[PDB]
Amino acid sequence: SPLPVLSWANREEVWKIMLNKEKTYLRDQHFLEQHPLLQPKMRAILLDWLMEVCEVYKLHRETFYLAQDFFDRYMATQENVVKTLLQLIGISSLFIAAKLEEIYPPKLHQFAYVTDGACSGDEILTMELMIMKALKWRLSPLTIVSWLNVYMQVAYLNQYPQQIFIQIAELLDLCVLDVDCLEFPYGILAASALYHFSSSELMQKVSGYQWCDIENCVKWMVPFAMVIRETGSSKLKHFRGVADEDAHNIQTHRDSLDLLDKARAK
Amino acid sequence: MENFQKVEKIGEGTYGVVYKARNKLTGEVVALKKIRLDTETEGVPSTAIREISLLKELNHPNIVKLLDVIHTENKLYLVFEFLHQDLKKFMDASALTGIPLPLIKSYLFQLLQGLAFCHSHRVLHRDLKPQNLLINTEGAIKLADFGLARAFGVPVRTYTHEVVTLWYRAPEILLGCKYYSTAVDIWSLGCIFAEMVTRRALFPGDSEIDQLFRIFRTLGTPDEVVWPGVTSMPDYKPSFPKWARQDFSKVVPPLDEDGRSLLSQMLHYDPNKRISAKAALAHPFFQDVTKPVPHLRL
Protein backbone atom coordinates (compact mmCIF):
# COMPACT_ATOMS: atom_id res chain seq x y z
CA SER A 1 0.00 0.00 0.00
CA PRO A 2 2.07 2.96 -1.27
CA LEU A 3 -0.90 5.40 -1.18
CA PRO A 4 -0.63 7.92 1.71
CA VAL A 5 -3.38 8.19 4.44
CA LEU A 6 -6.35 8.98 2.17
CA SER A 7 -8.95 11.48 3.46
CA TRP A 8 -11.89 10.10 1.29
CA ALA A 9 -11.44 6.39 2.21
CA ASN A 10 -8.87 4.00 3.89
CA ARG A 11 -5.45 4.26 2.06
CA GLU A 12 -5.13 0.43 2.08
CA GLU A 13 -8.85 -0.13 1.25
CA VAL A 14 -8.61 1.89 -2.00
CA TRP A 15 -5.34 0.12 -2.94
CA LYS A 16 -6.70 -3.40 -2.19
CA ILE A 17 -9.83 -2.73 -4.29
CA MET A 18 -7.57 -1.74 -7.24
CA LEU A 19 -5.56 -4.96 -6.80
CA ASN A 20 -8.71 -7.10 -6.55
CA LYS A 21 -9.87 -5.65 -9.92
CA GLU A 22 -6.75 -7.05 -11.71
CA LYS A 23 -7.55 -10.46 -10.13
CA THR A 24 -11.07 -10.40 -11.67
CA TYR A 25 -10.14 -8.95 -15.12
CA LEU A 26 -8.18 -11.65 -17.04
CA ARG A 27 -5.91 -11.37 -20.10
CA ASP A 28 -4.08 -14.15 -22.05
CA GLN A 29 -0.73 -13.79 -23.87
CA HIS A 30 -1.58 -16.90 -26.00
CA PHE A 31 -5.08 -15.85 -27.17
CA LEU A 32 -3.86 -16.02 -30.81
CA GLU A 33 -3.48 -19.84 -30.36
CA GLN A 34 -7.37 -19.83 -30.63
CA HIS A 35 -7.21 -17.97 -34.02
CA PRO A 36 -4.60 -19.91 -36.07
CA LEU A 37 -5.20 -17.76 -39.17
CA LEU A 38 -3.82 -14.76 -37.19
CA GLN A 39 -0.21 -13.86 -36.33
CA PRO A 40 1.08 -11.66 -33.41
CA LYS A 41 2.36 -9.03 -35.88
CA MET A 42 -1.33 -8.45 -36.96
CA ARG A 43 -2.30 -7.29 -33.44
CA ALA A 44 0.74 -4.96 -33.41
CA ILE A 45 -0.28 -3.28 -36.70
CA LEU A 46 -3.87 -2.93 -35.47
CA LEU A 47 -2.97 -1.30 -32.10
CA ASP A 48 -0.46 1.00 -33.85
CA TRP A 49 -3.25 2.07 -36.26
CA LEU A 50 -5.73 2.65 -33.38
CA MET A 51 -3.01 4.71 -31.63
CA GLU A 52 -2.72 6.92 -34.73
CA VAL A 53 -6.49 7.48 -35.13
CA CYS A 54 -6.51 8.40 -31.38
CA GLU A 55 -3.83 11.07 -31.95
CA VAL A 56 -5.76 12.33 -35.06
CA TYR A 57 -9.01 12.76 -33.03
CA LYS A 58 -7.04 13.98 -29.94
CA LEU A 59 -8.39 11.09 -27.85
CA HIS A 60 -7.19 10.34 -24.30
CA ARG A 61 -4.54 7.67 -23.56
CA GLU A 62 -7.18 5.98 -21.32
CA THR A 63 -9.44 5.71 -24.40
CA PHE A 64 -6.68 3.94 -26.33
CA TYR A 65 -5.91 1.57 -23.43
CA LEU A 66 -9.61 0.80 -22.95
CA ALA A 67 -9.87 -0.21 -26.63
CA GLN A 68 -6.62 -2.29 -26.34
CA ASP A 69 -7.99 -4.18 -23.31
CA PHE A 70 -11.44 -4.63 -24.88
CA PHE A 71 -9.81 -6.02 -28.08
CA ASP A 72 -7.41 -8.37 -26.25
CA ARG A 73 -10.04 -9.66 -23.79
CA TYR A 74 -12.72 -10.07 -26.51
CA MET A 75 -10.49 -12.15 -28.78
CA ALA A 76 -9.80 -14.46 -25.78
CA THR A 77 -13.56 -15.32 -25.92
CA GLN A 78 -13.49 -15.79 -29.77
CA GLU A 79 -12.07 -18.39 -32.24
CA ASN A 80 -10.75 -18.59 -35.81
CA VAL A 81 -10.94 -14.84 -36.49
CA VAL A 82 -9.95 -13.72 -39.99
CA LYS A 83 -7.41 -10.96 -40.91
CA THR A 84 -10.21 -8.85 -42.54
CA LEU A 85 -12.41 -8.89 -39.40
CA LEU A 86 -9.71 -7.27 -37.20
CA GLN A 87 -10.20 -3.63 -38.42
CA LEU A 88 -13.89 -3.71 -37.31
CA ILE A 89 -13.28 -5.30 -33.90
CA GLY A 90 -10.55 -2.74 -33.07
CA ILE A 91 -12.48 0.34 -34.21
CA SER A 92 -15.65 -0.90 -32.40
CA SER A 93 -13.56 -1.49 -29.23
CA LEU A 94 -12.40 2.15 -29.69
CA PHE A 95 -15.99 3.31 -30.25
CA ILE A 96 -17.08 1.88 -26.86
CA ALA A 97 -13.96 3.28 -25.17
CA ALA A 98 -14.51 6.82 -26.58
CA LYS A 99 -18.15 6.79 -25.44
CA LEU A 100 -17.09 5.70 -21.93
CA GLU A 101 -14.04 7.95 -21.42
CA GLU A 102 -14.48 11.11 -23.58
CA ILE A 103 -16.91 13.97 -22.72
CA TYR A 104 -17.73 14.84 -26.34
CA PRO A 105 -16.54 11.71 -28.14
CA PRO A 106 -16.28 11.48 -31.96
CA LYS A 107 -19.47 10.54 -33.80
CA LEU A 108 -20.03 7.05 -35.28
CA HIS A 109 -19.63 8.44 -38.84
CA GLN A 110 -16.02 9.56 -37.97
CA PHE A 111 -15.19 6.04 -36.69
CA ALA A 112 -16.54 4.61 -40.00
CA TYR A 113 -14.67 7.38 -41.91
CA VAL A 114 -11.18 6.32 -40.63
CA THR A 115 -11.69 2.77 -42.01
CA ASP A 116 -11.66 4.17 -45.64
CA GLY A 117 -15.09 2.57 -46.26
CA ALA A 118 -14.15 -0.95 -45.06
CA CYS A 119 -16.45 -0.48 -42.02
CA SER A 120 -19.87 1.17 -41.92
CA GLY A 121 -21.92 2.53 -38.99
CA ASP A 122 -24.22 -0.51 -38.88
CA GLU A 123 -21.26 -2.91 -38.81
CA ILE A 124 -19.76 -0.97 -35.83
CA LEU A 125 -23.10 -0.88 -33.95
CA THR A 126 -23.49 -4.63 -34.51
CA MET A 127 -19.86 -5.29 -33.44
CA GLU A 128 -19.99 -3.10 -30.28
CA LEU A 129 -22.96 -5.19 -29.10
CA MET A 130 -21.07 -8.45 -29.77
CA ILE A 131 -18.04 -7.07 -27.88
CA MET A 132 -19.98 -5.79 -24.85
CA LYS A 133 -22.08 -8.95 -24.58
CA ALA A 134 -19.06 -11.28 -24.92
CA LEU A 135 -17.13 -9.23 -22.32
CA LYS A 136 -20.16 -9.75 -19.94
CA TRP A 137 -20.48 -5.91 -19.76
CA ARG A 138 -17.24 -5.74 -17.69
CA LEU A 139 -15.92 -2.58 -19.33
CA SER A 140 -14.42 -0.84 -16.23
CA PRO A 141 -10.82 -2.26 -16.02
CA LEU A 142 -7.71 -0.59 -14.68
CA THR A 143 -5.67 0.09 -17.85
CA ILE A 144 -1.84 0.03 -18.16
CA VAL A 145 -1.90 3.85 -18.42
CA SER A 146 -4.26 4.29 -15.41
CA TRP A 147 -1.61 2.72 -13.14
CA LEU A 148 1.01 5.17 -14.50
CA ASN A 149 -1.33 8.07 -13.56
CA VAL A 150 -1.80 6.64 -10.01
CA TYR A 151 2.01 6.20 -9.68
CA MET A 152 2.61 9.82 -10.75
CA GLN A 153 -0.06 11.15 -8.36
CA VAL A 154 1.54 9.23 -5.44
CA ALA A 155 5.11 10.42 -6.24
CA TYR A 156 3.96 14.07 -6.19
CA LEU A 157 1.30 14.04 -3.41
CA ASN A 158 4.28 13.16 -1.07
CA GLN A 159 -1.18 17.04 -10.19
CA TYR A 160 2.38 16.05 -11.42
CA PRO A 161 5.00 16.94 -14.21
CA GLN A 162 3.78 16.09 -17.72
CA GLN A 163 7.09 15.54 -19.62
CA ILE A 164 8.13 12.55 -17.48
CA PHE A 165 4.65 10.99 -17.77
CA ILE A 166 4.67 10.99 -21.60
CA GLN A 167 8.18 9.45 -21.69
CA ILE A 168 7.06 6.45 -19.60
CA ALA A 169 3.76 6.25 -21.56
CA GLU A 170 5.83 6.17 -24.81
CA LEU A 171 7.66 3.06 -23.58
CA LEU A 172 4.40 1.35 -22.48
CA ASP A 173 2.86 2.06 -25.92
CA LEU A 174 5.75 0.11 -27.49
CA CYS A 175 5.49 -2.80 -25.02
CA VAL A 176 1.72 -3.04 -25.55
CA LEU A 177 2.29 -3.91 -29.27
CA ASP A 178 3.92 -7.25 -28.17
CA VAL A 179 1.22 -9.72 -27.04
CA ASP A 180 3.70 -11.19 -24.47
CA CYS A 181 3.12 -8.13 -22.21
CA LEU A 182 -0.27 -9.69 -21.37
CA GLU A 183 1.58 -12.23 -19.15
CA PHE A 184 2.45 -9.48 -16.63
CA PRO A 185 -0.35 -7.74 -14.70
CA TYR A 186 -1.14 -4.19 -15.87
CA GLY A 187 0.20 -2.69 -12.60
CA ILE A 188 3.46 -4.67 -12.95
CA LEU A 189 3.86 -3.47 -16.56
CA ALA A 190 3.50 0.21 -15.43
CA ALA A 191 5.81 -0.07 -12.41
CA SER A 192 8.42 -1.83 -14.61
CA ALA A 193 8.27 0.94 -17.18
CA LEU A 194 8.60 3.61 -14.45
CA TYR A 195 11.64 1.71 -12.99
CA HIS A 196 13.43 1.98 -16.40
CA PHE A 197 13.18 5.79 -16.14
CA SER A 198 13.85 5.99 -12.37
CA SER A 199 14.94 3.34 -9.74
CA SER A 200 13.66 0.38 -7.63
CA GLU A 201 13.37 2.71 -4.61
CA LEU A 202 10.96 5.16 -6.36
CA MET A 203 9.05 2.23 -7.95
CA GLN A 204 8.50 0.67 -4.49
CA LYS A 205 7.55 4.06 -2.93
CA VAL A 206 4.75 4.71 -5.49
CA SER A 207 3.63 1.16 -6.41
CA GLY A 208 4.31 -0.85 -3.24
CA TYR A 209 5.78 -3.62 -5.42
CA GLN A 210 9.09 -5.12 -4.28
CA TRP A 211 11.95 -5.84 -6.72
CA CYS A 212 11.06 -9.60 -6.84
CA ASP A 213 7.50 -8.67 -7.95
CA ILE A 214 8.68 -6.70 -11.02
CA GLU A 215 12.07 -8.40 -11.78
CA ASN A 216 10.58 -10.85 -14.31
CA CYS A 217 8.76 -8.01 -16.11
CA VAL A 218 11.79 -5.61 -16.09
CA LYS A 219 13.83 -8.41 -17.75
CA TRP A 220 11.32 -8.77 -20.64
CA MET A 221 10.98 -4.93 -20.85
CA VAL A 222 14.75 -4.37 -21.07
CA PRO A 223 15.01 -4.51 -24.99
CA PHE A 224 12.10 -2.07 -25.46
CA ALA A 225 13.60 0.41 -22.98
CA MET A 226 16.86 0.38 -24.97
CA VAL A 227 15.26 1.21 -28.27
CA ILE A 228 13.43 4.13 -26.53
CA ARG A 229 16.76 5.22 -24.92
CA GLU A 230 18.83 4.88 -28.15
CA THR A 231 16.55 7.33 -29.99
CA GLY A 232 15.74 9.72 -27.12
CA SER A 233 12.28 10.26 -25.62
CA SER A 234 9.76 12.65 -27.28
CA LYS A 235 8.73 16.13 -26.02
CA LEU A 236 5.27 17.20 -24.80
CA LYS A 237 3.08 18.47 -27.68
CA HIS A 238 0.34 21.17 -27.68
CA PHE A 239 -3.12 20.19 -28.92
CA ARG A 240 -5.63 22.72 -30.22
CA GLY A 241 -8.66 23.02 -27.93
CA VAL A 242 -6.89 20.91 -25.28
CA ALA A 243 -6.24 22.71 -21.93
CA ASP A 244 -2.48 22.59 -21.29
CA GLU A 245 -2.90 20.94 -17.84
CA ASP A 246 -4.45 17.85 -19.58
CA ALA A 247 -1.98 17.75 -22.61
CA HIS A 248 0.01 14.76 -21.20
CA ASN A 249 -3.29 12.74 -21.24
CA ILE A 250 -3.70 12.96 -25.05
CA GLN A 251 -2.73 9.80 -27.04
CA THR A 252 0.31 10.24 -29.35
CA HIS A 253 1.74 8.22 -32.29
CA ARG A 254 5.37 7.38 -33.35
CA ASP A 255 7.21 5.17 -35.97
CA SER A 256 6.91 2.40 -33.25
CA LEU A 257 6.60 -0.39 -35.86
CA ASP A 258 10.31 -0.38 -36.79
CA LEU A 259 11.21 0.27 -33.10
CA LEU A 260 9.32 -2.98 -32.28
CA ASP A 261 11.42 -4.85 -34.95
CA LYS A 262 14.74 -3.73 -33.36
CA ALA A 263 13.44 -4.60 -29.87
CA ARG A 264 12.53 -8.25 -30.71
CA ALA A 265 15.93 -8.70 -32.49
CA LYS A 266 17.85 -8.20 -29.20
CA MET B 1 -37.65 -11.26 -22.67
CA GLU B 2 -40.86 -13.41 -22.73
CA ASN B 3 -40.58 -14.35 -19.01
CA PHE B 4 -41.60 -10.82 -17.88
CA GLN B 5 -45.09 -9.32 -17.49
CA LYS B 6 -45.23 -5.51 -17.22
CA VAL B 7 -47.18 -4.46 -14.13
CA GLU B 8 -46.95 -0.63 -14.50
CA LYS B 9 -44.84 2.35 -15.66
CA ILE B 10 -42.75 3.78 -12.81
CA GLY B 11 -40.98 6.63 -14.58
CA GLU B 12 -39.21 7.85 -17.70
CA GLY B 13 -35.79 9.26 -18.57
CA THR B 14 -33.89 10.56 -21.63
CA TYR B 15 -32.16 7.09 -21.84
CA GLY B 16 -35.25 4.87 -21.19
CA VAL B 17 -38.52 4.04 -19.40
CA VAL B 18 -38.72 2.22 -16.03
CA TYR B 19 -41.46 -0.42 -15.33
CA LYS B 20 -42.49 -2.60 -12.42
CA ALA B 21 -42.57 -6.19 -13.72
CA ARG B 22 -43.20 -9.81 -12.69
CA ASN B 23 -41.07 -12.71 -13.91
CA LYS B 24 -44.42 -14.60 -14.55
CA LEU B 25 -42.86 -18.01 -13.86
CA THR B 26 -40.97 -17.19 -10.56
CA GLY B 27 -43.07 -14.36 -9.10
CA GLU B 28 -39.90 -12.23 -8.78
CA VAL B 29 -40.90 -8.55 -8.84
CA VAL B 30 -38.29 -6.55 -10.77
CA ALA B 31 -37.74 -3.01 -12.18
CA LEU B 32 -37.05 -2.96 -15.95
CA LYS B 33 -35.22 -0.07 -17.62
CA LYS B 34 -36.12 -0.35 -21.34
CA ILE B 35 -33.67 1.28 -23.81
CA ARG B 36 -34.80 1.61 -27.43
CA LEU B 37 -31.71 1.37 -29.64
CA ASP B 38 -33.44 2.24 -32.98
CA THR B 39 -33.92 5.82 -31.58
CA GLU B 40 -30.15 6.33 -30.98
CA THR B 41 -27.81 7.12 -33.89
CA GLU B 42 -24.74 6.28 -31.70
CA GLY B 43 -25.67 2.76 -30.64
CA VAL B 44 -25.88 1.87 -26.92
CA PRO B 45 -25.96 5.24 -25.14
CA SER B 46 -22.64 6.14 -23.48
CA THR B 47 -24.52 6.70 -20.20
CA ALA B 48 -26.20 3.22 -20.34
CA ILE B 49 -22.85 1.47 -21.05
CA ARG B 50 -21.31 3.27 -18.09
CA GLU B 51 -24.23 2.56 -15.70
CA ILE B 52 -24.29 -1.21 -16.56
CA SER B 53 -20.50 -1.50 -16.21
CA LEU B 54 -20.30 0.49 -12.96
CA LEU B 55 -23.19 -1.37 -11.34
CA LYS B 56 -21.65 -4.81 -12.11
CA GLU B 57 -18.60 -3.71 -10.02
CA LEU B 58 -20.50 -1.93 -7.22
CA ASN B 59 -21.86 -4.84 -5.16
CA HIS B 60 -22.98 -3.39 -1.84
CA PRO B 61 -26.23 -3.86 0.11
CA ASN B 62 -26.85 -0.06 0.01
CA ILE B 63 -26.57 0.13 -3.84
CA VAL B 64 -29.34 -1.08 -6.25
CA LYS B 65 -28.72 -4.57 -7.53
CA LEU B 66 -28.58 -4.92 -11.30
CA LEU B 67 -29.88 -8.45 -11.84
CA ASP B 68 -29.56 -8.89 -15.67
CA VAL B 69 -29.00 -7.23 -19.07
CA ILE B 70 -31.10 -8.58 -21.98
CA HIS B 71 -30.67 -7.69 -25.67
CA THR B 72 -33.85 -7.88 -27.80
CA GLU B 73 -34.77 -6.63 -31.35
CA ASN B 74 -33.35 -3.01 -31.15
CA LYS B 75 -34.11 -2.91 -27.37
CA LEU B 76 -31.81 -3.25 -24.36
CA TYR B 77 -33.33 -4.20 -21.03
CA LEU B 78 -31.70 -3.61 -17.65
CA VAL B 79 -33.33 -5.80 -15.00
CA PHE B 80 -32.94 -4.49 -11.46
CA GLU B 81 -34.32 -5.38 -8.02
CA PHE B 82 -37.63 -3.65 -7.25
CA LEU B 83 -37.98 -1.21 -4.31
CA HIS B 84 -41.51 0.07 -3.53
CA GLN B 85 -40.74 3.76 -2.81
CA ASP B 86 -38.13 6.54 -3.16
CA LEU B 87 -37.05 8.97 -0.39
CA LYS B 88 -38.86 11.91 -2.00
CA LYS B 89 -42.25 10.13 -1.90
CA PHE B 90 -41.47 8.83 1.63
CA MET B 91 -40.56 12.29 2.94
CA ASP B 92 -43.74 13.87 1.41
CA ALA B 93 -45.90 11.17 3.06
CA SER B 94 -44.13 11.88 6.39
CA ALA B 95 -44.39 15.73 6.12
CA LEU B 96 -46.98 16.16 8.87
CA THR B 97 -46.13 13.33 11.26
CA GLY B 98 -42.35 13.74 10.84
CA ILE B 99 -39.79 10.94 10.30
CA PRO B 100 -38.75 9.23 13.59
CA LEU B 101 -35.15 10.24 14.55
CA PRO B 102 -33.96 6.56 14.78
CA LEU B 103 -35.18 6.06 11.18
CA ILE B 104 -33.51 9.33 10.05
CA LYS B 105 -30.28 8.12 11.73
CA SER B 106 -30.55 4.60 10.30
CA TYR B 107 -31.16 5.97 6.77
CA LEU B 108 -28.27 8.48 6.96
CA PHE B 109 -25.81 5.84 8.21
CA GLN B 110 -26.90 3.41 5.45
CA LEU B 111 -26.59 6.15 2.77
CA LEU B 112 -23.09 6.99 4.10
CA GLN B 113 -22.07 3.29 3.96
CA GLY B 114 -23.17 2.91 0.33
CA LEU B 115 -21.47 6.20 -0.58
CA ALA B 116 -18.15 5.23 1.13
CA PHE B 117 -18.17 2.03 -0.98
CA CYS B 118 -18.60 4.11 -4.23
CA HIS B 119 -15.85 6.47 -3.16
CA SER B 120 -13.44 3.58 -2.25
CA HIS B 121 -14.05 2.19 -5.78
CA ARG B 122 -13.07 5.73 -7.05
CA VAL B 123 -16.63 6.55 -8.27
CA LEU B 124 -18.45 9.91 -7.99
CA HIS B 125 -22.28 9.56 -7.94
CA ARG B 126 -22.80 13.27 -8.83
CA ASP B 127 -26.65 13.07 -8.60
CA LEU B 128 -27.64 12.31 -4.99
CA LYS B 129 -31.23 13.55 -4.57
CA PRO B 130 -34.19 11.99 -2.69
CA GLN B 131 -35.91 10.56 -5.79
CA ASN B 132 -32.67 8.65 -6.64
CA LEU B 133 -32.61 7.01 -3.13
CA LEU B 134 -34.82 3.88 -2.96
CA ILE B 135 -36.14 2.38 0.26
CA ASN B 136 -37.63 -1.05 1.05
CA THR B 137 -40.32 -2.04 3.63
CA GLU B 138 -37.78 -3.46 6.12
CA GLY B 139 -35.80 -0.29 6.83
CA ALA B 140 -33.21 -0.46 4.02
CA ILE B 141 -32.26 2.48 1.70
CA LYS B 142 -30.07 2.19 -1.43
CA LEU B 143 -28.34 4.61 -3.83
CA ALA B 144 -29.81 4.40 -7.34
CA ASP B 145 -29.69 6.17 -10.81
CA PHE B 146 -25.99 6.03 -11.58
CA GLY B 147 -26.66 7.59 -15.05
CA LEU B 148 -24.44 10.57 -14.12
CA ALA B 149 -21.83 8.65 -12.05
CA ARG B 150 -18.25 9.26 -13.20
CA ALA B 151 -15.04 7.60 -11.97
CA PHE B 152 -12.08 9.65 -10.76
CA GLY B 153 -8.26 8.98 -10.80
CA VAL B 154 -7.96 11.73 -13.41
CA PRO B 155 -10.56 14.06 -11.79
CA VAL B 156 -13.97 14.58 -13.49
CA ARG B 157 -14.28 17.96 -15.29
CA THR B 158 -17.28 20.36 -14.94
CA TYR B 159 -19.54 21.42 -17.91
CA THR B 160 -22.63 23.45 -19.00
CA HIS B 161 -25.15 20.50 -19.22
CA GLU B 162 -28.08 19.00 -17.16
CA VAL B 163 -26.23 17.84 -13.98
CA VAL B 164 -27.33 17.31 -10.24
CA THR B 165 -30.58 19.17 -9.38
CA LEU B 166 -29.46 22.66 -8.42
CA TRP B 167 -30.97 22.14 -4.94
CA TYR B 168 -28.30 19.55 -3.99
CA ARG B 169 -25.38 21.13 -5.98
CA ALA B 170 -22.23 21.89 -3.90
CA PRO B 171 -21.01 25.55 -3.56
CA GLU B 172 -17.63 24.97 -5.25
CA ILE B 173 -19.61 23.89 -8.40
CA LEU B 174 -21.85 26.98 -8.31
CA LEU B 175 -18.68 29.13 -7.77
CA GLY B 176 -17.00 27.79 -10.93
CA CYS B 177 -14.64 25.01 -9.77
CA LYS B 178 -13.30 23.17 -12.88
CA TYR B 179 -13.14 19.71 -11.17
CA TYR B 180 -15.68 17.63 -9.15
CA SER B 181 -14.48 15.91 -5.94
CA THR B 182 -15.99 13.31 -3.48
CA ALA B 183 -17.01 16.38 -1.41
CA VAL B 184 -19.85 17.17 -3.85
CA ASP B 185 -21.60 13.89 -2.88
CA ILE B 186 -21.16 14.65 0.87
CA TRP B 187 -22.70 18.10 0.25
CA SER B 188 -25.77 16.43 -1.34
CA LEU B 189 -26.18 14.08 1.67
CA GLY B 190 -26.00 16.97 4.12
CA CYS B 191 -28.81 18.63 2.18
CA ILE B 192 -30.81 15.34 2.24
CA PHE B 193 -30.09 14.85 5.99
CA ALA B 194 -31.42 18.39 6.77
CA GLU B 195 -34.42 17.69 4.54
CA MET B 196 -35.28 14.48 6.49
CA VAL B 197 -35.27 16.51 9.77
CA THR B 198 -37.27 19.56 8.51
CA ARG B 199 -39.29 17.86 5.73
CA ARG B 200 -38.45 20.70 3.31
CA ALA B 201 -35.47 21.30 0.93
CA LEU B 202 -32.57 22.97 2.68
CA PHE B 203 -31.62 25.20 -0.30
CA PRO B 204 -34.42 25.34 -2.95
CA GLY B 205 -33.00 27.87 -5.45
CA ASP B 206 -34.39 28.76 -8.91
CA SER B 207 -31.09 29.74 -10.61
CA GLU B 208 -27.34 29.21 -9.97
CA ILE B 209 -27.15 32.65 -8.31
CA ASP B 210 -30.34 32.10 -6.23
CA GLN B 211 -28.97 28.73 -5.12
CA LEU B 212 -25.62 30.31 -4.07
CA PHE B 213 -27.38 33.22 -2.27
CA ARG B 214 -29.57 30.73 -0.34
CA ILE B 215 -26.44 28.80 0.72
CA PHE B 216 -24.75 32.07 1.83
CA ARG B 217 -27.88 33.20 3.70
CA THR B 218 -27.92 30.05 5.87
CA LEU B 219 -24.20 29.24 6.22
CA GLY B 220 -22.89 32.82 5.97
CA THR B 221 -21.03 34.38 3.02
CA PRO B 222 -17.63 32.63 2.96
CA ASP B 223 -14.13 34.19 3.06
CA GLU B 224 -10.42 33.16 2.68
CA VAL B 225 -10.28 32.05 6.33
CA VAL B 226 -13.22 29.58 6.17
CA TRP B 227 -12.40 28.59 2.55
CA PRO B 228 -8.82 29.16 1.37
CA GLY B 229 -9.13 30.19 -2.28
CA VAL B 230 -12.81 31.17 -2.49
CA THR B 231 -12.17 34.86 -3.52
CA SER B 232 -9.85 33.72 -6.37
CA MET B 233 -12.59 31.52 -7.94
CA PRO B 234 -14.10 31.93 -11.43
CA ASP B 235 -17.71 32.80 -10.51
CA TYR B 236 -17.03 34.55 -7.15
CA LYS B 237 -17.86 38.28 -7.06
CA PRO B 238 -16.67 40.73 -4.37
CA SER B 239 -20.19 42.28 -4.75
CA PHE B 240 -21.83 39.25 -2.98
CA PRO B 241 -23.88 40.35 0.07
CA LYS B 242 -22.20 39.50 3.39
CA TRP B 243 -24.73 37.45 5.44
CA ALA B 244 -23.78 35.81 8.74
CA ARG B 245 -24.09 32.13 9.59
CA GLN B 246 -27.41 31.17 11.14
CA ASP B 247 -27.52 29.13 14.37
CA PHE B 248 -28.17 25.45 13.63
CA SER B 249 -30.94 25.52 16.27
CA LYS B 250 -32.94 27.78 13.82
CA VAL B 251 -31.91 25.74 10.69
CA VAL B 252 -32.46 22.19 12.04
CA PRO B 253 -34.36 22.57 15.38
CA PRO B 254 -35.23 18.84 16.07
CA LEU B 255 -31.59 17.80 15.72
CA ASP B 256 -29.40 17.17 18.77
CA GLU B 257 -25.85 18.50 19.45
CA ASP B 258 -24.29 15.42 17.77
CA GLY B 259 -26.63 15.84 14.77
CA ARG B 260 -25.92 19.56 14.37
CA SER B 261 -22.17 18.71 14.46
CA LEU B 262 -22.27 16.12 11.65
CA LEU B 263 -24.41 18.42 9.49
CA SER B 264 -21.92 21.33 9.83
CA GLN B 265 -19.04 18.98 8.89
CA MET B 266 -21.03 17.73 5.88
CA LEU B 267 -21.87 21.31 4.80
CA HIS B 268 -18.36 22.75 5.26
CA TYR B 269 -17.57 25.32 2.49
CA ASP B 270 -14.05 23.98 1.89
CA PRO B 271 -14.06 20.73 -0.15
CA ASN B 272 -10.76 19.77 1.58
CA LYS B 273 -12.16 20.24 5.10
CA ARG B 274 -15.69 18.80 4.40
CA ILE B 275 -16.02 15.40 6.17
CA SER B 276 -15.61 12.18 4.15
CA ALA B 277 -18.20 9.31 4.02
CA LYS B 278 -15.75 7.03 5.92
CA ALA B 279 -15.10 9.73 8.58
CA ALA B 280 -18.84 10.52 8.87
CA LEU B 281 -19.51 6.84 9.77
CA ALA B 282 -17.19 7.29 12.82
CA HIS B 283 -19.01 10.44 14.07
CA PRO B 284 -20.54 10.25 17.59
CA PHE B 285 -24.08 10.78 16.08
CA PHE B 286 -24.13 7.08 14.99
CA GLN B 287 -22.45 5.72 18.20
CA ASP B 288 -25.74 3.99 19.15
CA VAL B 289 -26.05 2.36 15.67
CA THR B 290 -22.42 1.23 15.16
CA LYS B 291 -19.76 -0.27 17.45
CA PRO B 292 -16.15 0.82 16.73
CA VAL B 293 -13.47 -1.63 15.57
CA PRO B 294 -9.88 -2.11 16.78
CA HIS B 295 -7.51 -0.21 14.50
CA LEU B 296 -4.28 -1.98 13.54
CA ARG B 297 -1.51 0.49 14.60
CA LEU B 298 0.91 -1.11 12.07
Ligand SMILES: CCNS(=O)(=O)N1CC[C@H](Nc2nc(N[C@@H](CC)[C@@H](C)O)nc3c2ncn3CC)C1
Ligand atom coordinates in the same frame (compact mmCIF):
# COMPACT_ATOMS: atom_id res chain seq x y z
C1 LIG C 1 -40.91 7.53 -9.35
C2 LIG C 1 -41.92 6.92 -8.45
N1 LIG C 1 -41.42 6.87 -7.07
S1 LIG C 1 -42.25 6.04 -5.95
O1 LIG C 1 -43.62 6.15 -6.33
O2 LIG C 1 -41.83 6.46 -4.65
N2 LIG C 1 -41.84 4.48 -6.18
C3 LIG C 1 -42.73 3.51 -6.85
C4 LIG C 1 -41.79 2.36 -7.22
C5 LIG C 1 -40.46 3.09 -7.44
N3 LIG C 1 -39.31 2.19 -7.50
C6 LIG C 1 -38.22 2.39 -8.29
N4 LIG C 1 -38.07 3.59 -8.87
C7 LIG C 1 -37.00 3.82 -9.66
N5 LIG C 1 -36.91 5.05 -10.21
C8 LIG C 1 -35.93 5.49 -11.19
C9 LIG C 1 -36.42 6.76 -11.87
C10 LIG C 1 -37.87 6.67 -12.35
C11 LIG C 1 -34.51 5.66 -10.62
C12 LIG C 1 -34.47 6.18 -9.20
O3 LIG C 1 -33.82 4.42 -10.71
N6 LIG C 1 -36.02 2.94 -9.94
C13 LIG C 1 -36.20 1.76 -9.35
C14 LIG C 1 -37.25 1.40 -8.53
N7 LIG C 1 -37.10 0.09 -8.09
C15 LIG C 1 -35.99 -0.30 -8.66
N8 LIG C 1 -35.39 0.65 -9.43
C16 LIG C 1 -34.13 0.54 -10.21
C17 LIG C 1 -34.36 0.66 -11.70
C18 LIG C 1 -40.43 4.04 -6.25
